Design a protein around this motif. Structure first.
Motif, mmCIF file in Angstrom:
data_model
loop_
_atom_site.group_PDB
_atom_site.id
_atom_site.type_symbol
_atom_site.label_atom_id
_atom_site.label_comp_id
_atom_site.label_asym_id
_atom_site.label_seq_id
_atom_site.Cartn_x
_atom_site.Cartn_y
_atom_site.Cartn_z
ATOM 1 N N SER A 36 38.121 70.655 66.924
ATOM 2 C CA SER A 36 37.972 71.757 67.871
ATOM 3 C C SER A 36 39.328 72.315 68.281
ATOM 4 C CB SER A 36 37.197 71.302 69.107
ATOM 5 N N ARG B 93 44.723 59.818 70.459
ATOM 6 C CA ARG B 93 44.978 61.215 70.770
ATOM 7 C C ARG B 93 46.339 61.442 71.407
ATOM 8 N NH1 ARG B 93 38.657 62.227 72.435
ATOM 9 N NH2 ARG B 93 38.116 61.346 70.393
ATOM 10 N N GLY B 292 31.366 61.966 83.359
ATOM 11 C CA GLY B 292 32.397 61.322 84.146
ATOM 12 C C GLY B 292 33.810 61.705 83.765
#
Ligand SMILES: *O=P([O])([O])O[C]C([C])([C])[C]([O])C(=O)[N][C][C]C(=O)[N][C][C]SC(=O)[C][C][C][C][C]C(=O)O[C]
Ligand SMILES: *OP(=O)(O)OCC(C)(C)[C@H](O)C(=O)NCCC(=O)NCCSC(=O)CCCCCC(=O)OC
Ligand SMILES: Nc1ncnc2c1ncn2[C@@H]1O[C@H](COP(=O)(O)O)[C@@H](O)[C@H]1O
Ligand SMILES: Nc1ncnc2c1ncn2[C@@H]1O[C@H](COP(=O)(O)O)[C@@H](O)[C@H]1O
Lengths: 75, 529, 529, 75
Positions: A36, B93, B292
């Motif tokens: 994305s 990430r 959350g």
């Protein structure tokens, strides 16, 4: 160098897929496996190569090569 | 360790082998890749313990994992702590430099890395010193983990040790110079499982997790134990479905084909699922998403409630277990229309069993819960990290005044609903990752011609928040937004900056609002630009 | 701390206030900036202690210093340890990212930074968390350090504490993932001072440091205590001249005008001094340079001996005090001609008092000192760092087998002369800074088209060693050396790579030598390219 | 744009000193305050702008603008 050829070569350069193998119906996430986030720097270069400004609402609409081609040729 | 059997220690092995329920023929599903019952899962855990022992992993060692949500990650959640070793969960990430820093800081002995994360390793593999072995994971029979497991027996006597031995660790990139390391013990994880099960299992009819559910995570599973949910599911002995890489269409297919009823995600993923064309001809009226990530917006909540989705919000963070708060609706509130439902379900919620959660000002003075006064949240719970690993000053600032400082400013109603108004800092949060405004300010200030750079955050739907930058040019200096955007992008291309800065959206201005003292009015700037 | 006066503790205050000699009217000279006697130096040290106490510096705190060789650095060498705090010496020649990492790792409370080092701070100041105060130093009356000192009294009662309290720390960038932190205690510094004074003061007629010398350092003074020499000079009460920034012409002027007789430097600085046109009409026949950077070449030694310079070499490193070896000439060797003199003076030398220094193979087997067999040097001494700060695995590898592993391969003669043949690694050392070949290999391998990149080192005079890189291109790929050089330079421009890679001198090849196993033959490559 | 002007503008761009204020006798280290290392990337761009190759032995010889000017005009 038509609009479609330019769009496909942007897509190939961004996602690393050979432009000769790009298809009009290819989907950025499902088919080409573009994350994305990658798809966002994608929209960035589309604008860069067509000297335009893609609004966010439309940026979310493009998910396949076809989309981008239509949006560009139409402006 | 001297056992003293009358003295009971709370260990994760007791969580696996003394569950609430155990059906040997219940399934574990790895999306379109693998399926196997709970009996084979126990056998595989014992085999993995044997393999780790053969590799030379002792009770103080650290094993790091870098892969997607799968059965292997679930096996690692159990085998590594039960042997007495420490499970370091790597956030894939983060930028390669940050990943390397965390690996060096934690001093991992073995690394279990997925095949498609190999390139990230290839640009840092030279600067890694402590690691002795790499196990490459694949989704086929070629996997090295699978070949390691099948050379071992399905028998193993797991040790018993002190319940205060560290089980897991992971690094939070909340705004600081470098990522900070949190860690939890066996006791804390077991108590978190029991407490949250008590809180959300005893609800009357709404938003409950019980022994008849089918569970599928949509949280990356290296982010604070996937909110502890995989441990709870194993405790209940329910069917578990692991999707792997998050793709909206395959996720929807798994939901439909496996009849998933309980999941958790962040608002961005839910928005993507709802915006998918494949999600118009589906029956969503059995699903219980818990949102959350951050500030579930009311518009998305309303859009989900019209699909017959039991959507409710929860609150936690990396240092706190994570779960601290969940919204639970009383049977009178279950009959309100969609708008009031959306308002209630989007709050941060009431605190869970064994949580204190006061609201305080900068002098440590407990403010009243009148519903409008705002202050920072300070908490006490059985599952909080005592400090940051290998750190003193930040540790002291974390537990100042005898309470854990969350860093969020909220107000608390009369009945106990908590609503977070802002942060105690001017920091941005793009999707589910943390990005620092000060570092971006410095990087942009390293430009050829810059007068004042101030980075603020603006809301968004596909991202939750965008890191807007405001730059004032020098005398007779004119550079377009493209120049500064590319300058910032270059740093990201070197592995210095996280990819969440790819939508910086810089803006050129000429006047900077400043306070009476002269500080940049970031709130006034946000209301301005 | 319970004193027990009969129990004597070895502290740095005893080094300052119980010297070998103390002349209150001996001078301290800061080049063309300041001059003041030893009495005012003691008063200034007490004033600085008062100022640090006022700032809130306790016995466990860390104060970091970032400036040039001056009287202020000498005052910091004494005041900060005597208060019981820890002196962190920052290597200003590291990249900004490494500097920030070391600052965060050490957790400094106060930073004393020179004015002209401010830009380096400006690009990392945002990511610094622990620091509470910055003191900006200048070479005029505007200095903040000077203004802080003059508000305080010249009276102070220095505490007495355990001799094993840590005094100093600094970070070595020897090849690893990140810089490693070494530290020494008061006892170790005092014993290093006494031992080296015993070793080099008792020499008969050559290469001795005595109470009649005038001392001027030419080592950056943040590199391992300036080889301990400023502590020794203060102990002897000799005139001390501090040059500030190293400029060959001003250094020569200081040598001539102040009659300097004892100095220490690295081979590059000596070559620059000898190559200066101002150094042809000077009288060098009173000067006693100690060369200890790396491998004093015989050609430079001969060139210096014709100027009537008592040039001798020494050996040490960051983890070792530093001094481990010095060359001392017997009166029979003092009458050899210039060539044999140059051969002898360029050796690493004999070990100093209280040093063991065995030569060992990879199985920890002590090899014979026959003069040709080579092995790694392993040492024991009273002033070695017990481990790396906040590190376990590298610490264990440092002290493997009960000895400290230097990482240098040498052979030892019958009489005890040590000659270092190479390193136990394929690492480069440009001038006086460390650069890693593996990191450069990775950075170049991150290029668009690269097949195999191997970095080796080649000797040099103005730099001692250059980091040659050998790159093999891909199929039908042709990129000039300029492309790869600029690609590497870009990383340095971002603060990632040290400036010592600006003379990488890449080279394009097509065949890579490989062993029977297949490893790149770096020695064969060095003999090839 | 003669050889001297080009050399002086390289020196000004590298060391940050205005080209209008550059002097023929300026010394890189003593006068302009250029670090020994900076003076090496200096020699690098000289070659880059004059499409030549400066040998190391000569690179150590240039320490003032004058030097570089002479070396360049002479080739
Ligand atoms: O598929 P795309 O197009 O690439 O989408 C991009 C996106 C958002 C990255 C995508 O959705 C994705 O793959 N991952 C989203 C990022 C994410 O999942 N972040 C989750 C971790 S945030 C976190 O750890 C908060 C911890 C505290 C929460 C505790 C709690 O809620 O208790 C109830
Ligand atoms: O810029 P320039 O003036 O043209 O010259 C460039 C350099 C950088 C070379 C110039 O000389 C300079 O300013 N500094 C040189 C670098 C330097 O001084 N390094 C010294 C530190 S190396 C070190 O710490 C080794 C420690 C072990 C030695 C122990 C010992 O020798 O005991 C005897
Ligand atoms: N339900 C929520 N509502 C608002 N903010 C939230 C919620 N859950 C998480 N957050 C925010 O996301 C942060 C998580 O970051 P961390 O756990 O430290 O990695 C928290 O500190 C909160 O600021
Ligand atoms: N006299 C010397 N001869 C040869 N090598 C030396 C000498 N002094 C230092 N070195 C080298 O320079 C290194 C110093 O690096 P360090 O102290 O760790 O920062 C030593 O490890 C040696 O390899």
């Amino acid at each position: 160098s038509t609009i479609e050829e330019r769009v496909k070569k942007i897509i190939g350069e961004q996602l690393g897929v050979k432009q000769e193998e790009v298809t009009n119906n290819a989907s950025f996430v499902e088919d080409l496996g573009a994350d994305s986030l990658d798809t966002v720097e994608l929209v960035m270069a589309l604008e860069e190569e067509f000297d335009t400004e893609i609004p966010d609402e439309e940026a979310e609409k493009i998910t396949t090569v076809q989309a981008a081609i239509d949006y560009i040729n139409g402006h | 360790y001297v056992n003293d059997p009358s003295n009971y220690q709370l260990l994760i092995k007791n969580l696996l082998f003394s569950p609430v329920a155990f059906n040997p023929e219940q399934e574990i599903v790895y999306a379109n890749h693998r399926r196997h019952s709970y009996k084979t899962f126990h056998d595989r855990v014992r085999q993995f313990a044997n393999a780790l022992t053969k590799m030379g992993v002792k009770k103080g060692d650290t094993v790091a994992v870098m892969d997607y949500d799968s059965h292997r990650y679930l096996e690692c959640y159990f085998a590594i702590p039960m042997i007495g070793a420490k499970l370091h969960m790597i956030n894939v990430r983060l930028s390669p430099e940050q990943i390397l820093y965390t690996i060096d800081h934690a001093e991992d002995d073995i690394i279990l890395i997925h095949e498609e994360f190999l390139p990230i390793l290839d640009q840092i593999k030279g600067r890694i010193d402590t690691v002795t072995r790499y196990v490459v994971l694949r989704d086929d029979e070629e996997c090295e983990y699978e070949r390691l497991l099948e050379q071992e027996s399905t028998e193993y006597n797991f040790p018993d040790f002190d319940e205060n031995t560290v089980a897991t660790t992971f690094y939070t990139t909340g705004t600081t110079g470098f990522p900070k390391g949190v860690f939890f013990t066996h006791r804390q994880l077991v108590l978190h499982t029991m407490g949250i099960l008590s809180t959300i299992g005893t609800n009357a009819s709404q938003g409950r997790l019980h022994q008849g559910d089918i569970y599928m995570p949509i949280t990356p599973m290296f982010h604070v134990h996937a909110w502890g949910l995989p441990y709870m599911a194993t405790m209940l002995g329910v069917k578990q479905v692991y999707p792997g890489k998050y793709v909206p269409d395959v996720l929807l297919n798994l939901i439909e084909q496996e009849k998933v009823t309980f999941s958790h995600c962040v608002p961005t993923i839910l928005h993507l699922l709802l915006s998918s064309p494949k999600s118009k001809a589906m029956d969503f009226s059995g699903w219980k998403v818990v949102i959350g990530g951050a500030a579930l917006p009311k518009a998305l909540c309303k859009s989900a409630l019209e699909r017959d989705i039991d959507v409710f919000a929860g609150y936690g963070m990396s240092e706190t277990g994570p779960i601290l708060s969940i919204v639970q609706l009383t049977p009178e509130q279950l009959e309100l229309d969609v708008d009031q439902q959306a308002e209630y379900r989007s709050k941060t919620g009431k605190k869970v069993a064994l949580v204190e959660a006061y609201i305080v000002d900068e002098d440590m003075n407990k403010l009243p819960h009148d519903g409008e006064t705002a202050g920072e949240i300070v908490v006490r719970a059985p599952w909080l990290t005592p400090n940051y690993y290998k750190d003193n000053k930040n540790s002291k600032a974390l537990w100042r005044g005898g309470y854990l400082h969350t860093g969020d400013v909220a107000h608390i109603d009369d009945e106990g609903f908590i609503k977070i108004t802002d942060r105690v800092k001017d920091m941005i949060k793009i999707s589910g990752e943390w990005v620092s405004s000060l570092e971006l300010e410095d990087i942009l200030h390293q430009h050829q011609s810059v007068s004042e750079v101030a980075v603020i955050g603006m809301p968004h739907n596909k991202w939750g928040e965008v890191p807007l930058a405001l730059v004032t040019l020098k005398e007779d200096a004119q550079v377009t937004e493209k120049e500064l955007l590319g300058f910032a992008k270059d740093f990201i291309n070197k592995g210095i900056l996280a990819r969440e800065a790819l939508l910086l959206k810089v803006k050129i201005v000429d006047e900077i609002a400043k306070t009476s003292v002269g500080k940049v009015d970031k709130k006034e700037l946000r209301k301005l630009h």
